[PDB]
Amino acid sequence: QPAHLCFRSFVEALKVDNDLVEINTPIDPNLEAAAITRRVCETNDKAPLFNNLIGMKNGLFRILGAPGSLRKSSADRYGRLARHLALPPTASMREILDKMLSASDMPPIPPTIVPTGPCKENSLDDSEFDLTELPVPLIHKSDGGKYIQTYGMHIVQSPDGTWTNWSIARAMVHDKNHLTGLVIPPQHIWQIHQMWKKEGRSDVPWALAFGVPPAAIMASSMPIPDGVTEAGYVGAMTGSSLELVKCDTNDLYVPATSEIVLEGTLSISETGPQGPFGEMHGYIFPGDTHLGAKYKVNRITYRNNAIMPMSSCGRLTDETHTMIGSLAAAEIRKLCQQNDLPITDAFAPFESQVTWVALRVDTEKLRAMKTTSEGFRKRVGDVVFNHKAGYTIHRLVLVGDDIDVYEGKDVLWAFSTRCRPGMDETLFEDVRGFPLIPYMGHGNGPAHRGGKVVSDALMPTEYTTGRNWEAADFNQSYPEDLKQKVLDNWTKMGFSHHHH
Amino acid sequence: QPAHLCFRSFVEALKVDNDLVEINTPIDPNLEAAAITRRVCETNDKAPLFNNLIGMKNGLFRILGAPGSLRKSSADRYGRLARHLALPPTASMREILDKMLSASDMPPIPPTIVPTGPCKENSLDDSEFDLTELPVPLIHKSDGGKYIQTYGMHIVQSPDGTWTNWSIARAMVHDKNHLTGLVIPPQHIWQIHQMWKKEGRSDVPWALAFGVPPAAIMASSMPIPDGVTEAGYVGAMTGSSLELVKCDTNDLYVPATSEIVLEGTLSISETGPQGPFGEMHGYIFPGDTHLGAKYKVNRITYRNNAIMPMSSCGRLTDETHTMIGSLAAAEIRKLCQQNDLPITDAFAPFESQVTWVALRVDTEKLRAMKTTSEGFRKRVGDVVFNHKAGYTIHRLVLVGDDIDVYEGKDVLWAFSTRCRPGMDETLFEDVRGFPLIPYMGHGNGPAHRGGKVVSDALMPTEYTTGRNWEAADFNQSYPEDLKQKVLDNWTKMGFSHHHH
Ligand SMILES: Cc1cc2c3c(c1C)C(C)(C)C[C@@H](O)N3c1c(nc(O)[nH]c1=O)N2C[C@H](O)[C@H](O)[C@H](O)COP(=O)(O)O
Ligand SMILES: Cc1cc2c3c(c1C)C(C)(C)C[C@@H](O)N3c1c(nc(O)[nH]c1=O)N2C[C@H](O)[C@H](O)[C@H](O)COP(=O)(O)O
Ligand SMILES: [K+]
Ligand SMILES: [K+]
Ligand SMILES: [K+]
Ligand SMILES: [K+]
Ligand SMILES: [Mn+2]
Ligand SMILES: [Mn+2]
C-alpha cells in the first residue's frame, strides 16, 4: 500500500529515506521513550522507532515518535510531512498546504467499505485487556496520566448519521477500561458530543484509531468545515476512496490498515480527572488537573506487531507546531479568500509558538479597495477571529508582497519595523480565546474570551500608491550585475551545499 | 600598541584570528566594497580589508568593512567585538556589556596629551584636498550621497570646556570641503550643538576621527550619561589613560593613532541635503532627502597607508545591531537598577531589529515589592522611555528568571506565550519616539512621539508566590539521571562540536 494510505508503509518510507532510527534494545515507556523523542524534536533528528518497549505484551505495542516533526536539512525540512501526502520530500510548505486545501473545491470521494483488514488481525474483548497494563507512555515527568492518545484519530458521528468527524484530541488512561481527555468548544468532537447530549438517550458511539493512513491524520489535524466528513475530503485530496472496516462492537468504520483500534463510547454524563499535560506552547502546570470527558473502551483490535505513533509535544518543534499551526493557517488563508480579502498566503511562524498567523496581502488588490488600516484590520479580524479556523490564533500579522510568510525571520522583521504598537493594531476582546495558551488559562484575564489582536505591518503607501522603499540588503541595494560579480568572485577573493 | 587601543593593531588582530580577508585587487568604492561587506554581514563571514580601492591616492584610503559584525561560530560569535575591548574572543555578551558598564562606577581616567602620533604622518590643507575626489563609498544603490562617515567618531566640546563628547552619527560628502549629517535630539552631538547655538557667536569646533582606538569607538556608540566625557570613561574601562594629539587648526584633541582625521566646524546656521541612507532597520526610502547639519572641513591628517572603517548597514547583522542595540540595552539595565527596579540583564534581540529590549527580572525581589503588572509596567516604562538610553527602543519585554535574554528564541517564546496582547501591555504615547523606525517617520502617526509599549511576559504567580510551571522541554520535563542516560546513549542508539 502507498505510504500516504497505510501507516505501516509510511514507517517503511521513513526508513528507506534514512529518516528513522530503529531502536531494538529495551526502552522504558515511563519517560525514556518520550525523552528520546523530545530530544529528536528539539534537534530535528531522525524519527525513533522503539521496537522493544518495556511492558509490550502480545503485540501491544511498539512506538514511533516524532511522526510529523522536522528534518535537519533545509532542502527536505518538511519531508515527513510530504510523506503523509505522496508529495516529493523536497516539497515546500506552500505545496503541502495547497495539497491540504485542494479538496475544498472538489466533490468528496466517499470511503469504501471492505470486509476485513489488518486492524482485525488480533482482538481483545472486555475480559482480556487492561489499559493500565499496556506500555502507555508517561510523556512528561509532571503529566497527570499516561497519554495513550497523542497521534490517533477519534471517530464520532452526528446522531442523524450525516457527518462523521475525524480529529486529534489528547486522552490519557483513567483505569482499566476508560480514558479521559479534552473535549472543548468549538472543536468538532465537542460539537458532536453536544448533539448527543441534547438528544439525551445514549452515550456517543466512538472509536479511536492509532496508526491511521497518514493522509487521514493530517486531515484529522485540520479545521475543515463544520459538517464535512473528513474521510470524503481525504478521498478527494488523494484521488482515491479510503478503505474502511466496521467496528466489531458498533457501527462506526475505521481505516482498514489502522495499527490499533479502541471501540467504545464517549459519555454524555460522566467526567473524570484529566491533565495536566505538557502542551504545544511549551508548558506544564504541575497539579492543574481538571475534569475532562470520559471514554469507555469495550474492545481493542490491532495489527500484528502494532505500532503506536506518539507526539512528545512541547517546545519547538513537533506535530503540535508543524500540523496544528500550519493547517490552521491554511484554512485561514482560504477563509479570507472566500470573504473577498486579498490574502495570498498564510503561515503560523514557529517563532510565535504558532500563536500568530502572518497573512500575505496582494497589495495591488488592496489598493483597489481604497481602504485604510483601521478598516482593513477590523474586517480581517472579524472574519478570522469569529470563525473556528481562528480559534488557536491570537495575533494576525498583515504583511505586503515582499514578505515570505513561510520564513519566520522575514515575518519578524516586518512586524518589528512596520507595525507601530497600539496605533497600527486592533484588539479583539469579544471573541473566543484559546485557553491553552498560558497567558489565557493561567493569565490575568478571562481564560476563554479575548486576548486577540490584528497587527498591521503594511506600510501606508501600500494602501495608496505602492511600496516606497527598498530593503537595505544584498538583494535589493545593489544592481544585478554587481551582485552576480560578487557571487562569482566570492570564493576567489577568500570568503566561504543546498542539499546538505 | 594593544588592539583595543590602536586600530591598526586591531586590524592585525583580526588577521592573526583568521577573521580577515585581504583583498588586494582593485575594488570599486561605488557599491562594490559595500556589497561585499553587506554579504559578509548577512552571512557572518570574515571582515574584508580592501587594500586596493579604485580612487585611492596619496594614501587616502583603504577600507575595513564589518569591523563590529558577527563571526559564524557560536563559540566566538562576538569575537570582533571582544577584540575592541581586550576580552577573550569567546566572551559572552554579558561579559562584553559588563565591561562596557564597568567604568560607570569608577573615577574617570582623563586622557594624556602627547606631542605627536601616527595620525600626523600626512596632512592636506585647505588647498590640497577635495572630498569629492577621495574614494568615499556609495554604500547602497539609492543613497543620497557618499557616506564617508559610518564608523568614525565625532568630537565636539561644550562652550564652557567641561564636556567633550565622542559619538558616532552618519555623515556624507556635500562638496569639496563640506559634509552633511544627522544631528538629532536627544543625541549628545545635538545637545552640544544647541549650547553653541544659544551662545550664538561661532560655529562649533569639530573633529571627526576615523580608525580610532577600538575601545573608544565602542564608547562612542554607547549612551553614557549626559555631561560625561567619553575619553575618561574609556580610560577607566581600559585601566589606562588614552593618548591624544591636538588638532592643527583647533584646540580639540584626537586619538594619537587615528587613521584619518578631519578638522573643521559644525555650523550653527547652515544646513544642506542629507540622506536618504540605507539604515539600521533594513530600509531606504529612495528620494527621502531632508536638510541635515553641515560640517566644514579645513584640514585632513592621516596615517601612512590609512584605513577607513565602514559599516555597510541594513538587514541583520551589522554594527548598527551589535553595537547600537546591545550598548543601549546595557545602559538601560544600569538605569533600571539605579531606579531600584529588580532587573538583572537586558538585551535588544536581533530578531526585533534591535527595536525591543528584553529585561530579565529578579522575581524574588519582585515578589517582595508586592505589586501588580499594571503598576510595574508603568514604573519600568516611565523610567526607560523618559530617558535618553531608551530613545531607540520601542518595546520593552519583561521576563522572569528562567529566560536568557541574550537568546532571542527564548525571548520570542516568552513574549508569545506569557504576554496577553492588550491586557498585559501599557502603551506610551507621550514619550519621545525614534523617527528612524519605518513605522514612525514613514508611518501613520507622529514621527517623533509615542509608539512605545511595555509588554509584560511575567506570569501572574511571578508577582506573588513563584513560578508555577515547568517547561515541556528536554531540560525540564525529565529527571537528571534519565537525561544523562539519553545523552550518553545518543550516538550508540543511532542519532547525531562546540568550537566548530
Ligand atoms: C496534531 C495535534 C492536534 C491536536 C492535538 C495534538 C496533536 C499532535 C496533541 C499532541 C494530542 C495535543 C493536543 O493539545 N491536541 C489537541 C487538539 N485539539 C483539541 O481539541 N484537543 C487536543 O488535545 N489538536 C488540534 C486539533 O486536532 C485540530 O484543532 C483539529 O482541527 C480538530 O479537528 P476538527 O474538530 O476540526 O474536526
Ligand atoms: C554604531 C553606530 C551608531 C550610530 C550610527 C551608525 C553606527 C555604525 C551608522 C552606521 C553611522 C548609522 C547611523 O544611523 N548612526 C547614527 C547614530 N546615532 C545618531 O544620532 N545618528 C546616526 O546617524 N548611531 C548611534 C549613536 O552612536 C548612539 O546613539 C550613541 O549613544 C551616541 O553617542 P552619545 O550622543 O550618547 O554621546
Ligand atoms: K479535522
Ligand atoms: K503599519
Ligand atoms: K557616546
Ligand atoms: K503576563
Ligand atoms: Mn472536522
Ligand atoms: Mn556622550
Side-chain angles (χ1 to χ4, degrees), chain A residues 134-175 177-200 202-370:
Chain A
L134 294 174
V136 183
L138 186 64
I139 300 181
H140 317 84
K141 76 182 185 193
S142 297
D143 286 348
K146 303 181 182 305
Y147 272 85
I148 194 174
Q149 161 48 11
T150 63
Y151 205 74
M153 185 171 88
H154 294 281
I155 304 174
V156 292
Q157 184 179 93
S158 60
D160 73 7
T162 64
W163 176 22
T164 302
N165 198 84
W166 293 351
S167 62
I168 303 176
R170 72 186 193 209
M172 47 164 270
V173 176
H174 176 79
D175 71 11
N177 64 339
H178 297 81
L179 310 179
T180 57
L182 291 180
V183 173
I184 62 179
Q187 301 293 67
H188 291 161
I189 190 167
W190 177 92
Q191 292 189 17
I192 292 168
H193 173 98
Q194 293 287 109
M195 301 175 187
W196 288 82
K197 179 193 192 167
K198 289 175 202 170
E199 283 208 358
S202 72
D203 291 327
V204 187
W206 162 82
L208 173 55
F210 304 99
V212 297
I217 206 63
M218 291 281 284
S220 295
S221 299
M222 184 175 188
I224 78 171
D226 298 353
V228 178
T229 293
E230 281 73 8
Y233 187 96
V234 177
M237 186 169 64
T238 66
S240 62
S241 178
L242 293 181
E243 295 191 349
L244 308 181
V245 295
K246 203 181 77 70
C247 289
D248 303 324
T249 68
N250 69 37
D251 287 347
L252 297 175
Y253 288 84
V254 299
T257 66
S258 296
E259 294 284 328
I260 305 164
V261 179
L262 310 182
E263 311 183 353
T265 52
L266 163 58
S267 183
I268 63 162
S269 62
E270 295 324 297
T271 58
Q274 195 286 154
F277 182 56
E279 52 77 274
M280 67 182 288
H281 302 109
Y283 296 80
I284 184 166
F285 289 81
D288 190 35
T289 301
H290 298 286
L291 294 176
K294 192 174 186 173
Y295 304 83
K296 182 175 193 284
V297 179
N298 296 324
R299 190 164 177 90
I300 306 182
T301 75
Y302 56 104
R303 287 188 72 143
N304 300 327
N305 308 294
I307 306 167
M308 172 65 83
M310 179 187 69
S311 179
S312 184
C313 54
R315 288 199 68 182
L316 293 174
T317 316
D318 62 59
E319 299 67 32
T320 70
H321 317 118
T322 66
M323 298 168 56
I324 303 178
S326 310
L327 299 170
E331 195 73 13
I332 290 166
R333 185 223 302 180
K334 175 178 54 92
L335 173 68
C336 287
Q337 294 176 346
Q338 292 177 338
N339 285 270
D340 297 318
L341 299 172
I343 303 309
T344 69
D345 288 276
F347 190 63
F350 297 130
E351 300 86 336
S352 74
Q353 208 68 27
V354 302
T355 71
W356 298 10
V357 163
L359 300 175
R360 189 176 176 270
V361 178
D362 178 329
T363 65
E364 187 179 25
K365 291 183 180 190
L366 179 66
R367 283 180 282 280
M369 294 166 68
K370 307 278 181 183

Side-chain angles (χ1 to χ4, degrees), chain B residues 5 111-121 153-157 164-166 205-213 216 231 242-264 299-303:
Chain B
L5 300 178
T112 294
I113 301 171
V114 300
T116 201
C119 73
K120 305 294 190 172
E121 290 166 355
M153 185 171 88
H154 294 281
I155 304 174
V156 292
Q157 184 179 93
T164 302
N165 198 84
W166 293 351
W206 162 82
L208 173 55
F210 304 99
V212 297
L242 293 181
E243 295 191 349
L244 308 181
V245 295
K246 203 181 77 70
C247 289
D248 303 324
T249 68
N250 69 37
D251 287 347
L252 297 175
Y253 288 84
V254 299
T257 66
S258 296
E259 294 284 328
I260 305 164
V261 179
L262 310 183
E263 311 183 353
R299 190 164 177 90
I300 306 182
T301 75
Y302 56 104
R303 287 188 72 143

Side-chain angles (χ1 to χ4, degrees), chain A residues 42 45 139 141-142 281-284 315 410 413 417-418 420 424 444 446 449 470 472 474 477-478, chain B residues 42 45 139 141-142 281-284 315 410 413 417-418 420 424 444 446 449 470 472 474 477-478:
Chain A
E42 294 183 16
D45 215 321
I139 300 181
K141 76 182 185 193
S142 297
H281 302 109
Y283 296 80
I284 184 166
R315 288 199 68 182
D410 297 336
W413 174 58
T417 62
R418 305 179 189 183
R420 180 172 166 147
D424 291 347
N444 296 306
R449 211 87 189 140
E470 294 173 346
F474 183 80
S477 271
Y478 307 91
Chain B
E42 294 183 16
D45 215 321
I139 300 181
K141 76 182 185 193
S142 297
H281 302 109
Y283 296 80
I284 184 166
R315 288 199 68 182
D410 297 336
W413 174 58
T417 62
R418 305 179 189 183
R420 180 172 166 147
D424 291 347
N444 296 306
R449 211 87 189 140
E470 294 173 346
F474 183 80
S477 271
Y478 307 91

